[model samples]
Structure formats: structure tokens, C-alpha cells
Target: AQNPNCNIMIFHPTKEEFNDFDKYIAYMESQGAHRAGLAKIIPPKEWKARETYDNISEILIATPLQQVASGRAGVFTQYHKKKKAMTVGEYRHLANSKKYQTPPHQNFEDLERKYWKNRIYNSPIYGADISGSLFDENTKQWNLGHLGTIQDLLEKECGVVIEGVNTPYLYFGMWKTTFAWHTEDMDLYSINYLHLGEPKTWYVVPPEHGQRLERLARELFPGSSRGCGAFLRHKVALISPTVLKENGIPFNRITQEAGEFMVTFPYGYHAGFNHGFNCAEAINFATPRWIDYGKMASQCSCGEARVTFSMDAFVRILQPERYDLWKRGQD
Candidate 1:
């Protein structure tokens, strides 16, 4: 609970305590969300991502990947660590296309139903990336667990920023599925809740030494970075935690389990691979602390323009609305 260099903190909260809004935020802020924050909390009940929510297969079959704009979906294969993006229809076709349904695609489809269901792990389905405008169409209000309340208050109630790319996202992966080293967009905060399946192993670098990582990356890759996005801008050579410690950059490792929630703070450099098949839900949210950083990041040349919201636009809309919420403390 109190590790000086705790890159990821863990908590076990009872239903009553977890639902107490004020207490929940306070706990998160004190341990991880406010400073160099990456905290994990397990809910009282046994949880499973799939059982907690509806069958994703149904959603996939109904929505065309192209028309399901705003989010990102990728199929990560083991053979070459290859990544592919396809519609639910296309993916389904690929699954059932083969005569024998074999090879590198050791993937499978459930013929029990008239249609089919993709049983492969290691791909992230893009429900989070869908913009706020599509909220009604893509998701249900009840679907937002306690975490959703926090985001709704900030974006809808407080109106200090746009819906940053922190919420409404799902992660589906099996052994070796991964997310490379990167910080939260615009230095915002993030929350990831594992619904079920095998645990995900995480590697994180504290805030102070993140710049060292940037320098090390450049030194090692030397102009390898060729784009504007974080993961997309350039190829980030695999810098294992061992490599980081050898270079004098301390890092932390954690194996995330089912029913647990992990919160990542602004500029928290982190990466990880799935230990086995799993489904996890994730989203990004902002606190008042993010205002300055958002402005700064918006000015920078490097950023994921499509995945991230326009900070400038959020600021423009936020100023007036923020004033109204706590106007003069009159109420």
C-alpha cells in the first residue's frame, strides 16, 4: 500500500466504501491519481469482463467496423506480432473463411449459433475511442460503473474539458498481446478494469525519469521516430524493465488480476503484455491538474490527433461552463 516508488498501488474496497463517491476519489487522489499515479483496486465481488457486460460478439456482428468510426480495433497475431484492423464482418469472414479453419490463425468460431463468434484474444476492440457524440448510440448509461460517474461529472457536469480518450474502451487479448511504452494523451489520467480471464503484466516508469526514457529511446533508435503519434510516431525499440534499471531508470512490475481496477496518472510511462486471454475495460479522464498540461500538449507537434480530443476546443467550451458550475460560490 505504501511503497515509496510504488508505480502501481493496489486496494480492496467494499461495496459501501467503493460507492461512496467522495471517499473513492479521495483514496484514488491520495495514492495515485494526483501525483505519480497508477493504482489498482479490486472490487468486493468476483468479476469477469464478459459476464459483467453483454457478449461483444453480438455488438461486433451488428456494427460495421467502418461505420463504427472514432475508436480503434486491431487484431494482433502471434506469428510476427502482426496487427490488423477489420470490421466485425470482415473479421468474422476471416474466421469462418478457411475450409479447415486452421494455421497461424489457430483462431476459432462458434458454429453453435447461426452466425459466428470470434474466440481469439489479443485484439483491442474500439468502444472507448468512440467520441462523446456517439455516446447514446454506442453505449448505455447503466454500463458505466463507478468510474463512469467520475468521467461524467468532469466532462458533462464540470465541463472543464472535452471527453479525452480515457473512457469507454475495451481491451481483448491473449498471451503476448501488448501495448508499447507511452504516456497518457495530453498527460491525462487513465483507469483500466479487468473484467476476467488471465492477468495482464504491466511495466511502468515513474514520472521523474520519463524524460530519461525519451532520451534513451532517441539515443537507441536515433531518428527512428517518424510520425506524430506516441505509439505511431516511431518504432519504440523494446526497452525491457531490466534494460531500464541497467540504464539507472527505476521501474515497477505488476500482474493485474480479475475484478481489479488500475488507475494511471498524467505522463505515467507504462507498457505491458497480456499473460493470457483476458478482457479489460479502460478509459481516460482529466482532473483540474490536467488543465495546464492539456494546453501544453495541444501546442506540441507530437500527439495522436485522431485518438485524442482537441484540447483547444475543450478549453474554449470549458471556460464559460466551468464558471457557471461554481459561479461565485453563490449556491
Candidate 2:
């Protein structure tokens, strides 16, 4: 049932190509790979990096056990209201359990009566700032924080760490645990490295179709969209590709295996679920070309309540002379 037209471009980069991160990305972008919103890069087979998680065992985090059915999106937060706090170990045990695989109430009638019967938990240890703890510092090439593009643009220019955006985050995912559809924060580009474990299924909508997808979301969830331009930021909405195809929204489906990286372009909408237990690390970065996109996002009213890394601050640092002139003109 997969769409052939929606297949994402996968590149097997040579060591040289992989090392030159910016050059490789620009080449791929030139080839229209960004049109798919995401691309998969398989590192040279000899590449390797070690992850250390000893320090993460006792950290308490929040998780939600979603009630999901095959080929159907999970119910929104308003309907499913159960969440709990547990250490990473405790959540992992429940995630690997075979007992939780099937909905307790199997029959359609019983499932209809009780929504929580189908329990599949998605425990995301998001925003952990694990850049220091997870990977060995020696492995600079593949490290999310040390990647050439990110280090050159975000680290060198910003001169300060921005958690989850510049500083990397580790995620723990289990069977059918979904990340609802949305763009990266402020529509910045993001890169995700799956350290190990089961493959993840991803769906992406091209940047050009981003507004089409947003329009569809508004039509499908009118209540949530009322007066809220960025309703998808709630991370509560989910739609199947079948519906997307019906609405003429261009989309591609791809699978990300262990030890591979997935990159999402600016303003590209994406969503997906894990096939089973896995660990991944991700961070956002912006190149010089992304400045205009970041500028527009800063002016958006939809993100008023959420505290974001100040685009103005970044621009000021990137171009102090221009910023001074612009500031003086406004006075």
C-alpha cells in the first residue's frame, strides 16, 4: 500500500562526502531531494560511534500510553487523558512487554466502549541536553552537536547553547509510538541520528505543500484551529497518508534504520511512529540560507506564548552593523 512516488531519496555517502557535511547537503538540495521534506543518509559502513547511557538511568520523565489502532491515528489529548511519570528503565520494561502488544479489549464492541484498552506507550526523553553524556567526544563527525554545518552556523554564531535546538536531545521510542505531524521549531532544519534499535517509519510533506497540509488540518480540526494559527504546535493532530493523498497533499513515506541519519528541511512537515524500542538523538540548525525563513517565523503571531531562541538576537550577532542601522531607523 505504499506510494512509489512518495519514496524518499537515500544517499550512501562516502567518507569524504560525509565529512564535508555542508557540501553534501547542498548537493542533495540541488538535486531536489528537499522537495520530499526529508532524506536518509547512510554513513560509510566503517563509521561507528559509541553511546553511553549510564547517567540516564535514574532520570524521571513523563510518558503517555496511547491507545492506537492499526492504520488509524491515535485520539487527541482531549479524549485520552492518562499520563504518568517513570524512570527510563521502568518505561523500557513496559515497552518491551508482549502482554501490552494487543489491546486488552480485542473485540470491536469492547474497544469502542473503552478507549484505553489499546495501550502503546511513547516515552520521549526529549530536551535532555545529553550532548555531553551520550556520545564520545572523539566521534566529532557524526556527533549531532559537532556536525560541521551546525558547529559552523549555530555554535560559532550564536555563541551560546540552546537546548533541544543546538544542544542535542535523546529520544526513547517503542512500538507504534507516534510523533505527530509538525515542522521543526521556528521551521529550522533538523537532523536525527538513530543510535540503535528498531527502525522508524516516517512521513513527510514537501515544504511547498506545507500550507496545503495546514489547510487540511484546519478543516479536519476546526475546533482546535479556532483563533490559533499554529494549532499543530499542540502536537495533538494526526492524519493518515490515505487522507493526505485524497486531499492532494504531496507526501513521501520512508523508513529509518539504526545507525542512519534523517534530515528534515526548513518548513517541511513530518510525522512518524517507531516500529519498536529504539534510541535516537536529534538537534536543529540553520544555515545562512535559512536566515530569511527564520526572519519570517520570528514575525509570526502563532508562537507568541512559546519562548523561542530570539531570531533577532541571532541576526544581531550575525550582522551587528546592519542590525545597528535597522535599530537606529526604528527609533
Candidate 3:
């Protein structure tokens, strides 16, 4: 909480200590929302408060490949070592050069370098290119957990529910992670907040280029990103009108909540962080559904769009209709 990397954004802590966040979540839920399934807690509390919240940290560790695959949660440093060591650039450099790339050679930047990177792990929350983990006395090793479980633990132990979905954890600083960018498979939207640590996030406003290309019948150029690629763009739409109005397209930030930052990707493009040890939390929607372009196009024309896609789209993609009691995302 003492992120002094000259984090500019003042902590907007509730006027009341630990105010209820349930309503905040409920409001978002009413509008249709889901998480990308990655989460963690900052300033982890005592064991007593770990039960109630839908914490996912442990689950994340249990599924390192899954979490690392998403590039959205805590992973062992060994895996990161693999990512840091055997990258495409590293491979290319290995082929051309005589030796292995050191951490400096295969590097990352934070807050400085016009991007950002941090030398210390000052903030309690971390992700992606993060190293180290919460030391657990029980295991004598880093405790693995999921971000979702944190709030559940907090609410159960602290006796409060923040109404809607909880905010994903983010660090305030400069950092980078080896994550490939691609689209998700759901209809819900997300608001990714990059807070604290150091430096900035390079956001290329939603896949307007790809969409425009599709509209113009151009080539579907796939991003050479390491994570999910042009996959999510075509499948998902940026659904948050509130954030969009406040931040225009191609939104980038120096730091979020402190150094510089930006909210991106529910409908934009984002690239490598110029910094290291930075943090971000994306508002995302992930369901077992695919994009129904034909239906989506029709829905854009008129209410008929609903009748065309919104109403029966999932049935065609997820095939929920085949189940006797499936309700298509209805909770």
C-alpha cells in the first residue's frame, strides 16, 4: 500500500474504512459481466479470512499451465525462467550470437526508458512477469492461490460482499510479462485497470483495424503476440460504454493510480510494457460461446439484431439448446 514510486493517483479509499463493495459488483453483474478467470490479492491477510472469498490463487497454482497460459495470475519463477530464457528473441539471438542472453540482454523496462520497470517488488500485488510469491509458513514455500479467492476470503472473514464482481488485482509500477494477446470466448465486457508499480501500458485501441479490414475485405493479419492473438478481437466486442467515453480510442497511460496507465482491450490492441513490475487488471467476459458475426451484424441494424443474434446466437455456437435445462448465461 506504500507504493512511493511517485504513484500519482491518490488512494481513493472509502471515506469509511472498508466500505461495502457488494453493490459495486451487483451493478456490474446486472449489466452482464464475467472475469477472464485470473485473480490475486494484495497485502494478503491472515489465514482466518481466506475461506469465504472466491479466492483463485491456490487454484491458479494448481493449474500453473492454465494460469501461465492466460498470463493472468501467479506462476512459479521456474516457469517464468523458461519464458524469460527461451523466448523467440532469445532463440534468435542464440542462433546468431555465441552465448545465452542474460536477464539484462533479454530484458524489460519500467517507468524509466519511456516505458517502465521496477528494481524492487514494493507493491503487495504482482502479475505476469512477476517473480517471488507469498511465503506460506505451512508449506515453507510460496502459497499458490487465485485472485477470485481473495475477495471471497475477505468477505467471509471480514463479513462483507461488494455486490458485483470483485475488481481484479493490479500492481502500481513498471513491469512486463510474457503474455500472448488473443480474444476470449464470451459476450461479457471488462474494464482493465492498471494501477501502481511503474511506467505505462501500450494500448492499440480495440481491433478497429482488423474490424475495418474485415469490413473492407482485407487480409486477417494475425498479431505475432505470444498470448491470445487476433482470437479475442473477432470473438469479443468492447462492451463498456462508460470507460470508453472517458478514455478515447488507442488509450495509453504513463502509469495507473500512480506512475502511468491505461484501460484497454475490451475493444483495443495492447503491446509490450516499456516497463517491468507494473500491474493491470482487465474487465473481461469469458463464456463457452463464440462470436456470431452474422447475428451480430443483424443486431446492429435494428432490434431485429436481437431477434437474429442476441436471441439465438449462443444456441448455434455453444449449443446450450441441446441440454434440457440450459439457459444460456442466465444466472
Which wins on lDDT, candidate 2 or candidate 3?
2
Per-residue C-alpha lDDT of model 1 across residues 1-331, encoded as one tens digit per residue: 4345544666777666755534675676666544444667776663223334433443332221211111112211111222345443344344333421222422221121111122232233222232221123332221233344334445655555444433466555444445657776556667777766666677777765677777766554444444422432222234655467667876776778776778777767787655444567676666566655554442123433233333334534545443332223222
**Residue 267 lDDT (model 2):** 83
lDDT of 2 at 14: 85
- The 0-to-1 C-alpha lDDT of every candidate, in the order given, reads 0.49, 0.64, 0.27
lDDT of 2 at 118: 33
Candidate 2's clash total is 0
Top lDDT hit: 2
How far is 300's C-alpha from truth in model 3 (Å)?
22
Position 76, candidate 3: lDDT: 12
lDDT comparing candidate 3 with the true structure? 0.27
TM-score of each: 0.62, 0.74, 0.33
> In candidate 2, what are the lDDT values of residues 168-223, reduced to their tens digit?
77776766566778887557889898877767788899876788898988888877
Give the CA lDDT, 0 to 100, for residue 27 in model 3: 31
In candidate 1, residue 182 scores what lDDT? Answer: 72
Q: Each prediction's Cα RMSD?
A: 10.5, 7.2, 14.3
